[PDB]
Every structure is written in structure tokens, then in C-alpha cells.
Design a protein around this nucleic acid. Structure first.
Ligand code: MG
Ligand code: MG
Ligand code: MG
Ligand code: MG
Ligand code: MG
Ligand code: MG
Ligand code: MG
Ligand code: MG
Ligand code: MG
Ligand code: MG
Ligand code: MG
Ligand code: MG
Ligand code: MG
Ligand code: MG
Ligand code: MG
Ligand code: MG
Ligand code: MG
Ligand code: MG
Ligand code: MG
Ligand code: MG
Ligand code: MG
Ligand code: MG
Ligand code: MG
Ligand code: MG
Ligand code: MG
Ligand code: MG
Lengths: 120, 113, 192, 144, 63, 276, 103
RNA sequence: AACGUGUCGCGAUGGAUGACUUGGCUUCCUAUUUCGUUGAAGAACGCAGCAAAGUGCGAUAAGUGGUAUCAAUUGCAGA
RNA sequence: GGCCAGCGAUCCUUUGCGUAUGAACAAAUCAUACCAGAGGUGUCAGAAUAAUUACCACAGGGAUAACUGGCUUAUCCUUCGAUGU
RNA sequence: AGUAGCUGGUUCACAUCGAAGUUUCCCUCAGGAUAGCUGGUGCUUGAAAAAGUAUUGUGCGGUAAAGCUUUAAAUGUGCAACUUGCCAAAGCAAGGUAUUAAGGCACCAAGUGGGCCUUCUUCGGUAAGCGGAGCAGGCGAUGCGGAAUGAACCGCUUAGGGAUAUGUGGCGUCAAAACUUAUGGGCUCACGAACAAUGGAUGACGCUCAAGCCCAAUUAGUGCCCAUUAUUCCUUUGGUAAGGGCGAGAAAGUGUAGCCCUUCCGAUGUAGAUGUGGCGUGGAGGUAAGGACGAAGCUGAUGGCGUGAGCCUCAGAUGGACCAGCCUCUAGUGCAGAUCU
RNA sequence: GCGUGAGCGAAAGUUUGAAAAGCACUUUGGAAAGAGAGUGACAUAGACCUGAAGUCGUGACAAUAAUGGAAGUACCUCCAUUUCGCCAAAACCAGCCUCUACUGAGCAAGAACGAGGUCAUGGUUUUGGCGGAAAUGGGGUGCCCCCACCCGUCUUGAAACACGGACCAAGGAGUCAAACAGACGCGCAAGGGAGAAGAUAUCAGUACUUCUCUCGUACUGAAAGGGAGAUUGUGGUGUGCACACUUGCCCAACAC
């Protein structure tokens, strides 16, 4: 189970980034890069992420139904509480953060269009 | 607002060029410093611990977090008001061009950009 | 600026975390730490602290000694009361000296392959603390037990042998080396 | 592991736990068990009381192979009998037979409550074992 | 030198431990024997009636 | 055996304004009068000279050695642990990745390279080829000059499979009949990526046995029983069977007016009494 | 010897150790594995060399000596002349056909 | 003021450090493996076009001869 | 036993006492053992021990003399990796 | 590499606790062993067998004083709150149906085993900064404040700081405070202010209706100053302490950059013990990453972070090619001191 | 190299560079050398990688027992951060603090009103000042006032007229083995474990196993020797978690 796995990868894993004594996750699927069981979605039976996808917000999801078939264990879906509505569809507790990342993904996307355009 | 801003220097580092300024706890019964006579240097102790919610916080207000490449920046994407990437000293000026125009696009702070 | 005289001597030394490296103890402490705090039950508070003990202080129990202590407990139970679960925070070991045992329902960290088979040969369940929590979240008619540790050969060495009251076992690779004439010996008995 | 020695902890604390006074020497008393009858007398007498002296008859050139008589109690004969074979052993019926030399035992001490009969087959027996073993309806048969 | 200084201090650190309670190491043994032997005869009979008593309670409890 | 000590040396005694360390004798040389033998001196002895009879090797109980190979295979069945330890498993069709038996029939190496892309393993083999560099530190002048990351461990049914998969760097090969915990858990961390062959996989309980059935090769070995029948404690704690049993400003009180009026409700009825 | 510790009898009061002063008396087994191969190579090197012939010659089933072991039935060291006679083999012929003899 | 003190910038003296390592140490192995009155090991003295040392050699003297190999040796010269 | 002090390990010897061992077997002898006393360690919880060194030596000691100041009227506080009578 | 009960040295930090110089024994007296003291680990359960204290009740005592070797203190000190013998016999006997405070037990182990001073009591000594004890407290191991100065006197004992208020000691200057206060009393003319010889010591000056002494005081017949102390506030750390909770965060958690918050108590410390998701070094198994757009190394009014060991960044108008992170393994791993090399 | 000798016995990295391309030529000098020039990517790479400390020279600068602590301030800051927010001041609320009765004029005596103080107390802003620079912080240097006995050491006692101590760099000291023990981790458990060795597959490793052996489950006696259940089950009793039931059973554990 995940209770056991997390207690295995907790002291070390590819994803733990214990730098300067600070501990952030390199995990693709973590939302706030906080090395926590709530978030370590690579580990969780179910998981949700709200990364950008070329201007578009992307909301990768991982219902457990796929089980252990990594090639297809994760299911993307491109797309502001609506994204949170999708993420809660799989992980209800992740949603409050999944909304707030999903926003900050938007301000980043707006901020960089301002920056990428200003780089001209 | 720090307890002590001074280093806790080793006793008599100033007389002996070889001694590093780095702290060693004094020993010897007769050490003026461990017997803690009032005119002497101080020793570090738990009481000089910094306030614990302002601890590790650089004057920028960010906690520094080491960064080595452009992928690390996303470790700070969602907590960019809490952590500030400090790019490692040995990343190339090459790669730093890439970390920096990307640390700009993401709104993450960098200590040495 | 305070009398502290006799305060430090009253400080107790207790384990507050397991030294066990075993992941499962830690999922098992994770449970009963929770369950001990979130329930009013004193059973969860015992299973939780014992679970934090040394494997020294978690002595194994004979299945022989469960069958004894259990029937001795259950024989008095009023008819239509099923017997208590026999929880132990330790290993449960088979006993050759008791070939046939009652359909016990023992619950322990670990079972010998012999204990587990004799336990199920009697038709008794050999359940873990996981479903102990799921069947007796509270220590409801659990019968928490401990394995013995006085007969442990380490404690046979406690004290001196040469001191008159004592029957400590001297440390010796050579049994015949410190053997002694009846005349020369410490007095066996002595009042405290 | 050198990491874990308290050698490594007290790097910096000048006397490595041996004391500023009363300095860590060499052999502050003698080598080994020196003064077992002198300045360590209180020590051997407290802890190793029988240590000095002689107690009995000598046995020049002891041969332990001839002396080899390992024992199994009645209470432990389930260790040898197959649990499957041992399943039904009425005293008046057929019994599991248990050669003890095969299993490495020589005498048969008659300890606890045997109750399942067996025809134990062993070199030696206790006064109480052959009695108990019979009262259970089993039988020791002497072998060598 | 024989000063007894710092001794009652060093002794009251862990207190003067008070003596063992009478209900503990209450061995007889070196007691005037003839009484001691009759006591065994009674205590052994207490045991046969204690066990005989529990045998009663169970038979009574089969009801 | 006799380094640092290969000199004639004697302390010059005391009364010569010199430390009593032994001094190399003779003359006409730089080393004459030089201190000798002590660990502190040049050319002198090391503190505790290293011995050939250090405990170099270890015993491990045959059972723990087995408990471990079991636990590290079971740890490779779990994709979170296996991607956790470093492997790029994102293209992998499934974990455990068992694969057709004729994968060991390959002769040419690029027959095998075609195979690795098929099962998606090549991204974790690229992980290795790229991970290869000159070792940091001294180890490089000690025949350890190149370090590279562990990649997928193909596990053949038997010895006949290897050839094409030799040389194909970053692809370790393994034999089911001699699985090595040094390879199953590189770094001592469980979770390696293993490409089981179908033949190597089907006989993997013939080797290690069941919880209920002994290994056919490892004697009376039998898989150790879980300490927990239900290894996710958090699901129990949140279970309805378990939820049912759960247990469901002034300082100065004398002079502060509101504080005193609170401690002593009658105080205002008393203060009214005070007027006059 | 301060404390309950068993009286130690560590027989190492001879100069077994190798230092500047002594060539020690030490037998490490660092070549144990290499030897295991050497023998293993050499037995295989030998069986190849004498293909038809059995790797090890016929040996008697003998009783073990004392009461501790008389129950045990170890491999012996060559047959009795009376055994070889009764089997009809010739005792000086027997070794040439791989049967161990023991006068 | 001067000297002297001190900070900093350069520079000298010094040779740490770091990187390097055709060396050591240790382990293991292999074999058609064990010197000499048929002059051994050791020691001496010598031999190169310029050669002191080291190496190689022994008045056939940095080699003669056999074999393979090849186009070099190389400071200069020389074939 | 004569109140209360009047006495002593291990090893060994020795004496007693009631069977045990001398291990291929057996008896006798011898020896050993168990067991209980005795012989003694008075340095009395128990090595078996003469001087000398100014020819001397080493490790230390100001734990300790002379000396050197102090105190007192001898102490041993400073100093024995040296404070010149 | 003889041995050394002796001498000298024995290298990171921090946190948690923290001694002994005494008992018995030893050809022991510069050393051991032993016990005590101390740490660690627990165990066991929670007014269990709590108490350096009284009260009450009940014993004990023969020192001071007394007395002429006897009565007798005070301080103490103990304690308490059916079956089977005896009898002549079944009745007796025996075993059975005030304040405060978490108690006890085990294990392993260190240092220590030169103590010193003082209080009071003594003993020896002509006396001593003398030898010996009893008691307790101290120094040792401990500062801080005060006595001008002082190891042990006085007060107070100690995390990093601020306010407040004090303690001993002061309030003429030195020196904070009576900007030399009193609308207080006496006394005093020359000295006066707890524990023979380098010139010179109420601490110095100086003071004299005192700035001295005794007494009392506090604005006057209508106080002030100074502590590492107290109290309070902030912060830290520890608690094997008490609870609550589970724009970014909300981790079921000993320990980290601590899951979060709340409250409470503690904090010194030599020898010593222990802890530490404590620091740091060479190497290894892993992982992750970096480097000719410049690795290591080195330099540094390069700042930043951390109580700290230290880490990090900046800058080299340094270098020229290797290498940091993280978990695991390892060790020839950390140096101002050895008349060290 | 040393010693009559037996014997002792070093230091030394040619690690310039990719290559010698190893500075021709001009110029001064008797020369060594210097100034140019040249090579090379670099010659502060020059016969030499790096290039520390300490020491020294020099320039500039601040300055006037040492060091040191505390706190400021002066000046400087190739530093950090912040601002285009920083310094202030006032207010409000809370907190906090300070500033009759009896008696025969006194106390051993109680509050009230009023006012003040304060953010190094909490919350509420307001208002101004400053804004290539400002601002806070750090750093450096000096000063001021104040505090402050050289460290290590054995020792009751060290600033000692006690020992060791000129500087710096590199090195330097609880190690390895083994036998026990306790504790802690792991494995299995009335068993545990192998060792030597073998057999195999592929690499002194891993995997595998026979047979044994070993510690343990039984102890005791000098020894011959003997060798432990109770009246389908805790030997009893006392005290004893948990649970059960409104006392039972008591685990362990101690005691008897
Ligand atoms: Mg037992
Ligand atoms: Mg210390
Ligand atoms: Mg120690
Ligand atoms: Mg000692
Ligand atoms: Mg001493
Ligand atoms: Mg013997
Ligand atoms: Mg003494
Ligand atoms: Mg050397
Ligand atoms: Mg050398
Ligand atoms: Mg030559
Ligand atoms: Mg004596
Ligand atoms: Mg003296
Ligand atoms: Mg010393
Ligand atoms: Mg303390
Ligand atoms: Mg001494
Ligand atoms: Mg009298
Ligand atoms: Mg009198
Ligand atoms: Mg003072
Ligand atoms: Mg003043
Ligand atoms: Mg402390
Ligand atoms: Mg090394
Ligand atoms: Mg500087
Ligand atoms: Mg070292
Ligand atoms: Mg250079
Ligand atoms: Mg002295
Ligand atoms: Mg036993």
C-alpha cells in the first residue's frame, strides 16, 4: 500500500530534493513540490496535477483504475475552478491546492506572455 | 531581527594566524571563556537560536533553495513567494542564461540572477 | 534560583519512538498511535506502548502458554460468551509440549511457522494487529498477554555469585572451572 | 564502522573519556587476571567465587564420544513423531515408532505429561520415562 | 585519612532507600523449626483445599 | 608489515633539548637525527598499521539473504518504488514487465536494441549512457574511472539467453536461478527496473515459493508472512468500523476592572457599596 | 577484570601478530575462493583427462566408530580382501578397475 | 613628522594545496618455474662517434649470430 | 565451654570418616577424589628475600626533604622539565 | 614499537544530564579492585514500599549544665499512626476459606578514590596560612553582583535579550545614587570609617556643624542607586511536559527548514555519560546533477544562512579539468600546544 | 652522503607547454642582467601546473603592552536587500504600570475619582520626512565610554616568581583482531547457525546443497551415576496490566 511505499521512499528517492536542508519534490506530479505524503502523487493510488501545456493549462490525472501500467497509468486533459472540478474528480483533497496551482499556472502563463513578448 | 549578529569566534584566534575564526568550545579549567568571566568572549548556546519563523529567511524574505538547472525552477513554481532559487556557483554562464530567462518567465525569485 | 533537589531523579526514561527499522512496525505504530489517542480505550494504549518496546522487552509467548492462560480465562466465561482474542505484542512460538490446543484466536506481531500451523490446525485464526484494529478497535474482549522473560538466560546472570544471598550464574565458558568444594562456597540462602 | 565509535564523538574533548586527573594509562593493574588473589581479590570473590582451587577427580584423556548421551524428554517426543503420523495414536492401537539414535538422542528422560503413546526406541531411559511411557500405553524398546 | 564529609550528602542523593515492606522477603528459614514444620503441614493443606475449592467453583459454573 | 619501522632509531634521551621521539641515527644524511617510528614523524609508522586480517567479509543468515531477495523483487513489482529509485519507466507497458520468451533468441545486438525500444525500456537505457562520466575523486585512478547509473535488469529464464544483450550498455542481465540482491537493490535501495522474461517469470514461484508452498529449489524456504494483513493503516483509520469507536486579555485581576468583575461577579454590587 | 565480565582467556600472549618485529603466525583465508576454483578446475581438468573413468573410485560402506557415531554409515577406505574375494574380484586387480582396497 | 601599528591593491619569499601519477602497498593466480667447479651469486675493471651516472654488454664489449618484424634511431651525427 | 580479645584462605601435606575414580575388563596394592579436622602464612584477606653506591642511573615528584619566600614560634603553602651556597 | 601503577599529548559543534576525592580490600600509600556518587537503558505501574520536615504516641541516650566519679538537658535517635504446634483438654498460637510529593525495581557503565575552605564542635600542638576528626555548607566544578583587591566571605546562584523591582553594598569625587537629603539625636579634635627597615595607602582623594562614630530616619512633629537575582515580556532550547488540530500551508509526525497551533516548567557546570534527518573529511554502492560560457584548489571590508561545527552565494583583472547534492557503505576522518615530527 | 668497521642512509615529481614554438633581433650593461620585440590561447606558463599560509617589499588609506568584550558613533564600503516602501511623529482601543473602617488625633486600615506613563506589549490606521539615489542590514577602519589577568597543564589552589608556548604549512594520537557481556537492530525460534567443503549457473561476488558439527531445548554429582507435569491441564498463595462482569481471569512480574 501507499502507507508502506511512502514510508519507503520517504527517506530517499529520486524525487526528494533535500537541498540546504530544505526538502522539495522533483516529482512531476506533486503540485507544490512539498515532500509530503498528501502530495507525493507518483506514489499515491490516485493523483492529480495541473501543469501547463504550451499556453494551455494541462491537468494530468491518475485514477487508480489503471493500476500499475505506467505507459497509460496517467491520463492528460487540456483545459478556473473547473480545473479544480476535474482534479477533485480523482483526488478530492488535492482540489483546494489543485485550484490554486491551476490559478498560478494561469498567472504564470499570463506573466510569461508579458515576459516573452518583452524579450523582443 | 537576529539575537546575535557577530560570529562566535574561537578564543584568541586574533593572536594566532593559523587558528581559524571558526568556533571551538574552550576547554581547560582555567579558560576565561568557558569559566565565562564577564569581559570574555561568549560561547554559542541554545539561547542564541534565532526566532523560528524568521529563521533561515534571507533579507529578501525568501528562504534560499539551491538550483542547478532549468528543471529545478519548477520545484519553486508553486512556492515562489516562499523559496528563492540560488543558482549553484558552478553552473555555467551558459546554463545560467537558460535558468535566468526561465526563472524570469516563471515568476520565481533568484538570489544570483 | 530554584530548588531542584530531587526533581531530576524523578525524571523517567521512556521510549517515545520505536528503534525498529521494520517498516511494518511503523505502520503498526502509525495505527495504534492514532488509535490510542483517538480512542478512550486502555487496550490501544498498551498495544501502542508495547509496540514501541525493544525486542528484548517484547518477549515471545508459547502457544502453550496462551492455551493455558486462555482456557483458564475462558472457562469461567458465562455460556454464550465467545472467548477473548489473545493479543500479544511479540512473537508467538509453537510448543512441542502441548500437541493439541483449543481453537484459539491469537493476535500477534509474528508467528512461528509452527505456531501458525498448530493454531490453524485447531481451526483458530492467526490474525494480525491490522484486523485486530478492525475487529477490536478498542480492546473489546481482547486478552493481552506477555511472553516470559524471567527464565531468560541473561537474567540468570544478574547479581554476583559469591555474594551470599545470591544464586546468580557466574559468566564462564568453562563450567568446571569455577566449580568449588561445598565447604568453600557462599551461603546459599540469606534473608533480605 | 569507525563513524559510530565514541572515538569520533570525543574528537576535541582532550582526554577521551578517561579523565583529566587519573589519567588513562596502560595497565594500572596487571595484565589480564593479575592480582586475582590480591588487588582484584574483591572482584573474583564477588563474581567468580569458585575460580581458585581444585574440586574433583581428574579424568586423564577424556573421550567425550563414549560419554555422548544426549536426552529427549517425553514431553518433547512430538518433535520427532510426524504430526500426520501422530494424528491417531490410541494406546490400544498402532503407534508411531521413534528411533532416537536417528534423531540424535540417547537417553529418554521422563519429564512432562506425555499423553500420546509412542513406541520410543532409545539406548537409555529414565525410571520415570519408561513408567510414564507405559502408563500412556506406549513402550520404550531398548536399542543400542 | 578518614573524613566522613560529603557522605550523608552523597547518601541522600538517592535518598536513604527505605527498608523493604514486611510483606515481601518474609522467608521463615532459620525460624524456630518446630513451628516452621507445622506451618508447612497447614500450608500444604491450604493448597489442597484451594485447588479443591476451584474444582468446586467450575463444577458449580457448569450451571 | 614493517614500514616506517625499517630504521635504526633511538631516542636521544632527555637532557638534549629535543622531544624524546626516537631519532634516526648516523650522519651525512638529511634523515639523521630525524624523528622516527612514531605515527607523528615523517617516514615513520602509521598509527595502527592496517592488517590483512581485518574482517573483510560478512556472514548473512541464509534466510535474511533470502528475505532480502524476496523483498527487493517485491519492491520491483511496485512502479512507484521503481520509478522512485531512478528508472525512467514512463514508456513501460506495465510493471512487472514480463516479456516474450524468445527475447533471448536474439543474436545481433541491434535485434535487442529493437527489443528495448519496443518495451519502452530504452528511455532508462538512455538514462545510463548519458549518466556515464569520469568518476569524481580518487577512484578514477583505481580502475573505477567510469561510473554510470544502473539501468534495467533483464532477467533471463536460464543461461542460454545472453548474447545480443551483452555489450548493450546500461542493460544488466540477470538469471532467475541466481538473482543477486546487489543487483536487485543497487545502492541498497529497493526498486530496480526489471524486465522479466516470460520463462524467467513463470518459474519465479518455483524458485522462491509461496506464502503457503515451499520453494522447490530453496529447501524449506517459504515466503515470509506479512506482519500486516492489511498493509495500509491509513485506510483502516478512516474505516467506518474504526470511526465508530473514536472519541467524538487582562492579567492583573485585582486592579483590572473587567477581570475582577469576571472573577468576582458580585464586585460591582460591592463597588456600589463602596460609594459613600 | 573490573565488573561481572567473564574471566577472559584469550590465548594471544604469543607473537602471532605480524609487526616490524615479528613474522607472525597467521593463516588468513583470503585465497579461499581462488582455491575453491583451483580444485574445481582441477577435478574438472582431471575428469576430462580420463573421460570414461569415474571421478572417484569405489569405496566400502563402513560403520563409524564410537557410540556417538556407530549409528552413522560413512564411506570407507577400500574393501577388505575377504570382501573382494567374496565378490569374486581379485584384490590386486581391484584397484586397476577402480575398486579401492584396504588390507 | 618619524618610527611603529593597521586595513586594502599589487609584488617578492615560500612551497602548502588541488588536480595529476609509467610508483608503492595488499590480495589473488599461473607454470614444462629454482644457481654453481661446464666457474655461481657478489665485487672489480672495462665497452658507444661524441657517454659521467644509470642501463646493456665483455677485448666479438649499449653487442656477434638465429628468428620475426619491419623503415627507422633520432640530442647531433651518422646508414 | 571458662560472656565479651586470644587468631587465618587457595595450593600442598597430613589425619579421620563412607563409598567413588584410576576411563579395554577385574580384584589387591598404590594414588586420587568427595567429606570433616589439622600443619600457616603475626606484613595476621596470606610472594619465599641482605647490604652498598660520593662512580652511580632512569621515570617522576614541590604529593616529599635540604634549599627559596610565607606562616609560626615547627608546618610543608610556592619551587625538584633547577630561583647558584 | 622491550616495559612503564610515572610524565607529556590525545584533533568538530550543540543539546541533555553531571560527579568524586569516601567505604572495604591490595607489598596497598603517585595504583587497583570494591561500594557510594553519575550517566545511559529501561522495566513496572501510577499518592504501590514517597519524605535529610513536623505533630502525636511510644522507646533509646548520659554529652553541656549540675554535683561531689553521680541527676540531667537542648540538639538528636528508633518505632507507630478447615487444616496442623502449645495447653490436661476444646481455649491460645499458625495458615486458610501536618505539609509536600508519582512508588518501587533492573541492567550496563563511566569518572572518581590527593581534596580544600569555612560554620559550629572539638582532639593534638608553645603556635601557625599547623596535623586530626564530627556537623553542615561551600570551592573544586561557577560564574554574576558586592566587600577597593581575594578559589572557597557577603547576596545570588547562571539560555539570548528588554522593562520592573530588589539582595549584599552603597548614595562628596573617583562612581550609579542624599546635584554633600533630614525641617534627626548624641559623641568626637587626633584620630575615625564584618569576614623597623625601597615611598604609600579608610581603595584614592579628601572629609572634621564629617564625607567619622552610635542611633533613628525617608522628605519630617504634616527617599535613591547598582545584579546573570525576583517578577513580567519577547525569543531560543529541552521536557521520555499539557492540550487542541490535520496569498500559502495544513505531513498522523522522536529527530529536519521541526505537520500546525496553544499553554506550562527547566536551562550554569570540571571529570564523565548520552543525544543529535548534528557539522565536516578521504573512499565506496545508489540517485540526481554540474563543468572549457571554466571543475577542484586557492584569494576575499562577497555578502547571506545556521546557536554552532559550518554551508551557500558573489568576486577573482585566480586556476585550468574535473566534480558538489542527497540516502547507504566505509575510514589511515577534523589538531595552537605533545622540550610533538 | 655518513661511519675504522659491523653498518646507517637520505632529499629529489623537471607535473613549462598541445607542441620548444624554449624569448631570434634591437637596446643598455664588463657581465649578470635590464628595456623593447617575439613565440604561445595564457611567460605574473621562462626550465617553469597550482602557487596557500606565514614573512617581506611597495602603493594607497585610516589612523594612534597589543588582543579582547559590549555598545555606539565617525568615515569607508568592488556587500546585501528594499524602495521609487524607509525614517519619523501623533492619536484609538486593549493590556500594563505608576500616581471607608476601626481606634483614641492615631492604626495593624479599605477602596474610589482623577490623571500620567508606556509598544522592547497587542491590535487600529493617520500624518509628515526621505525616495541616479535613498533606505535598512552586513562588512571595514578609528574613536569614545565601559568591561576585560596569557593560554594549555598537573593541582585544594594558576595571572602566577610552576611547567609547555616565535611564525606558518603538512603530518600527528582509542586502531585492528579475538573472546565475553549488557544494550539496541535484524532473521528464524524449541530450535538457531553454519564452518570446512562441494555442485553448479554466471565471477575472490550472487545463487545452491549434502553430511556433519556447533550453541540451545536438562539438570546434577568429585564420581560411578542418576535426571524433573497436575489431583487434555496456569502446582498453590500474595500483590499484580489489559479485558470481561458489575467480581472474575489475572498476562508479565515480583514475593512466599
Ligand atoms: Mg526456563
Ligand atoms: Mg567535558
Ligand atoms: Mg569513560
Ligand atoms: Mg584510573
Ligand atoms: Mg590519583
Ligand atoms: Mg579439571
Ligand atoms: Mg586518599
Ligand atoms: Mg611511511
Ligand atoms: Mg623517505
Ligand atoms: Mg657509462
Ligand atoms: Mg593485610
Ligand atoms: Mg608541597
Ligand atoms: Mg596530562
Ligand atoms: Mg544541571
Ligand atoms: Mg601526578
Ligand atoms: Mg557525666
Ligand atoms: Mg562538665
Ligand atoms: Mg567587587
Ligand atoms: Mg554620581
Ligand atoms: Mg548544560
Ligand atoms: Mg584514506
Ligand atoms: Mg582580512
Ligand atoms: Mg589520523
Ligand atoms: Mg608556477
Ligand atoms: Mg601543589
Ligand atoms: Mg541450561
Amino acid at each position: 500500500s501507499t502507507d508502506l511505499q511512502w514510508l519507503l521512499v520517504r527517506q530517499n528517492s529520486k524525487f526528494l530534493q533535500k537541498r540546504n536542508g530544505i526538502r522539495l519534490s522533483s516529482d512531476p506530479f506533486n503540485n507544490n513540490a512539498n515532500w509530503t505524503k498528501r502530495h507525493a502523487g507518483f506514489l499515491n493510488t490516485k493523483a492529480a496535477v495541473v501543469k501547463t501545456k504550451g499556453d494551455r493549462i494541462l491537468v494530468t490525472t491518475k485514477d487508480g483504475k489503471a493500476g500499475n501500467k505506467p505507459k497509460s497509468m496517467y491520463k492528460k486533459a487540456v483545459m478556473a475552478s473547473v480545473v479544480s472540478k476535474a482534479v477533485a474528480a480523482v483526488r478530492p483533497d488535492l482540489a483546494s491546492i489543485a485550484s490554486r496551482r491551476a490559478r498560478k499556472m494561469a498567472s504564470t502563463l499570463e506573466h510569461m506572455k508579458k515576459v516573452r513578448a518583452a524579450r523582443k | 531581527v537576529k539575537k546575535r549578529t557577530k560570529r562566535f569566534t574561537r578564543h584568541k584566534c586574533e593572536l594566532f594566524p593559523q587558528l581559524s575564526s571558526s568556533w571551538r568550545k574552550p576547554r581547560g579549567e582555567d579558560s576565561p571563556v568557558r569559566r565565562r568571566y564577564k569581559g570574555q568572549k561568549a560561547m554559542p548556546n541554545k539561547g542564541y537560536g534565532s526566532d523560528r519563523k524568521t529563521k533561515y529567511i534571507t533579507p529578501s524574505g525568501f528562504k534560499n533553495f539551491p538550483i542547478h538547472n532549468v528543471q529545478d525552477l519548477y520545484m519553486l513554481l508553486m512556492q515562489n513567494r516562499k523559496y528563492a532559487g540560488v543558482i549553484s556557483h558552478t553552473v555555467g554562464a551558459k546554463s545560467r542564461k537558460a535558468i535566468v530567462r526561465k526563472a524570469h518567465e516563471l515568476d520565481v525569485r533568484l538570489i544570483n540572477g | 534560583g530554584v530548588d531542584l533537589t530531587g526533581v531530576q531523579k524523578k525524571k523517567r526514561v521512556v521510549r517515545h519512538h520505536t528503534y525498529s527499522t521494520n517498516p511494518y512496525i511503523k505502520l503498526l505504530i502509525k495505527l495504534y498511535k492514532f488509535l490510542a489517542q483517538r480512542t478512550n480505550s486502555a487496550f490501544n494504549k498498551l498495544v501502542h506502548q508495547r509496540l514501541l518496546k525493544s525486542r528484548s522487552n517484547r518477549a515471545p509467548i508459547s502457544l502453550s502458554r496462551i492455551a493455558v492462560c486462555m482456557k483458564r480465562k475462558s472457562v469461567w466465561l458465562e455460556k454464550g460468551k465467545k472467548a477473548p482474542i489473545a493479543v500479544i505484542v511479540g512473537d508467538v512460538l509453537d510448543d512441542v509440549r502441548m500437541a493439541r490446543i483449543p481453537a484459539l484466536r491469537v493476535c500477534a506481531l509474528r508467528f512461528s511457522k509452527s505456531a501458525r500451523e498448530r493454531i490453524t490446525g485447531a481451526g483458530g485464526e492467526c490474525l494480525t494487529f491490522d484486523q485486530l484494529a478492525m475487529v477490536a478497535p478498542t480492546g473489546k474482549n481482547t486478552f493481552l498477554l506477555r511472553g516470559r522473560k524471567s527464565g531468560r538466560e541473561s537474567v540468570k546472570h544478574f547479581g554476583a555469585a559469591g555474594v551470599p544471598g545470591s544464586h546468580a550464574k557466574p559468566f564462564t565458558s568453562n563450567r568446571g572451572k569455577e566449580r568449588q568444594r561445598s565447604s568453600a562456597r557462599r551461603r546459599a540462602f540469606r534473608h533480605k | 564502522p569507525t563513524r559510530f565509535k565514541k572515538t569520533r564523538h570525543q574528537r576535541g574533548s582532550t582526554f577521551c573519556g578517561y579523565g583529566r586527573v587519573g589519567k588513562h594509562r596502560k595497565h594500572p593493574s596487571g595484565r589480564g587476571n593479575a592480582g586475582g588473589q590480591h588487588h582484584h581479590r574483591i572482584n573474583f570473590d564477588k563474581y567468580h567465587p569458585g575460580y581458585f582451587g581444585k574440586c574433583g577427580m581428574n579424568h586423564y584423556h577424556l573421550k567425550k564420544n563414549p560419554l555422548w548421551k544426549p536426552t529427549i524428554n517425553l514431553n518433547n517426543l512430538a518433535k520427532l513423531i510426524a504430526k500426520d503420523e501422530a494424528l491417531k495414536a490410541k494406546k490400544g492401537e498402532t503407534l508411531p515408532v521413534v528411533d532416537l539414535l536417528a534423531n540424535g538422542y540417547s537417553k529418554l528422560l521422563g519429564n512432562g505429561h506425555l499423553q500420546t503413546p509412542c513406541i520410543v526406541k532409545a539406548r537409555w531411559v529414565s525410571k520415570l520415562a519408561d513408567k510414564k511411557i507405559r502408563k500412556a500405553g506406549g513402550a520404550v524398546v531398548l536399542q543400542a | 585519612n578518614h573524613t566522613n564529609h560529603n557522605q550523608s550528602r552523597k547518601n541522600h542523593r538517592n535518598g536513604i532507600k527505605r527498608a523493604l515492606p514486611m510483606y515481601l522477603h518474609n522467608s521463615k528459614r532459620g525460624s524456630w523449626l518446630p513451628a516452621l514444620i507445622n506451618a508447612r503441614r497447614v500450608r500444604k493443606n491450604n493448597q489442597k483445599a484451594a485447588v479443591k475449592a476451584r474444582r468446586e467453583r467450575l463444577a458449580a459454573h457448569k450451571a | 608489515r614493517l614500514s616506517g619501522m625499517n630504521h635504526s632509531a633511538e631516542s636521544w634521551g632527555t637532557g638534549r633539548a629535543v622531544a624524546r621521539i626516537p631519532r634516526i641515527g648516523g650522519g651525512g644524511t638529511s634523515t639523521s637525527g630525524a624523528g622516527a617510528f612514531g605515527n607523528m614523524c615523517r617516514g615513520g609508522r602509521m598509527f595502527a598499521p592496517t592488517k590483512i586480517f581485518r574482517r573483510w567479509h560478512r556472514k548473512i543468515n541464509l534466510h535474511q539473504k533470502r528475505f532480502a531477495v524476496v523483498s527487493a523483487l517485491a519492491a520491483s513489482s511496485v512502479p512507484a518504488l521503481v520509478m522512485s529509485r531512478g528508472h525512467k519507466i514512463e514508456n513501460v507497458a506495465e510493471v512487472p514487465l514480463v516479456v516474450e520468451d524468445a527475447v533471448q533468441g536474439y543474436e545481433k545486438t541491434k535485434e535487442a536494441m529493437a527489443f528495448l525500444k519496443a518495451i519502452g525500456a530504452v528511455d532508462d537505457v538512455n538514462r545510463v549512457n548519458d549518466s556515464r562520466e569520469i568518476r569524481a575523486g580518487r577512484g578514477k585512478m583505481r580502475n573505477r574511472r567510469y561510473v554510470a547509473r544502473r539501468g534495467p535488469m533483464l532477467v533471463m529464464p536460464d543461461n542460454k539467453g545472453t548474447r545480443a544483450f551483452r555489450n548493450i550498455f546500461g542493460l544488466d542481465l540477470a538469471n532467475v536461478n541466481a538473482l543477486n540482491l546487489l543487483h536487485l537493490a543497487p545502492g541498497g535501495h529497493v526498486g530496480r527496473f526489471v524486465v522479466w522474461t516470460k520463462g524467467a517469470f513463470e518459474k519465479l514461484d518455483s524458485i522462491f515459493g509461496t506464502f503457503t508452498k515451499a520453494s522447490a529449489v530453496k529447501k524449506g524456504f517459504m515466503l515470509p508472512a506479512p506482519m500486516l494483513t492489511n498493509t495500509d493503516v491509513t485506510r483502516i483509520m478512516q474505516s467506518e468500523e474504526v470511526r465508530r469507536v473514536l472519541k467524538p486579555q487582562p492579567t492583573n485581576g485585582f486592579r483590572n476592572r473587567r477581570l475582577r468583575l469576571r472573577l468576582n461577579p458580585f464586585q460591582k454590587k460591592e463597588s456600589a457599596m463602596v460609594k459613600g | 577484570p573490573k565488573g561481572k565480565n567473564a574471566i577472559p582467556h584469550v590465548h594471544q600472549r604469543k607473537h602471532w601478530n605480524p609487526c616490524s618485529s615479528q613474522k607472525g603466525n597467521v593463516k588468513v583465508f583470503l585465497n579461499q575462493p581462488a582455491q575453491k576454483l583451483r580444485r574445481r578446475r582441477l577435478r574438472l581438468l582431471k575428469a576430462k583427462k580420463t573421460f570414461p573413468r569415474p571421478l572417484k573410485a569405489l569405496r566400502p560402506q563402513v560403520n563409524c566408530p564410537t557410540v556417538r557415531h556407530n549409528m552413522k554409515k560413512r564411506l570407507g577406505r577400500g574393501f577388505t580382501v575377504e570382501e573382494l574375494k567374496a565378490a569374486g574380484i581379485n584384490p590386486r586387480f581391484a584397484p586397476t578397475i577402480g575398486i579401492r582396497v584396504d588390507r
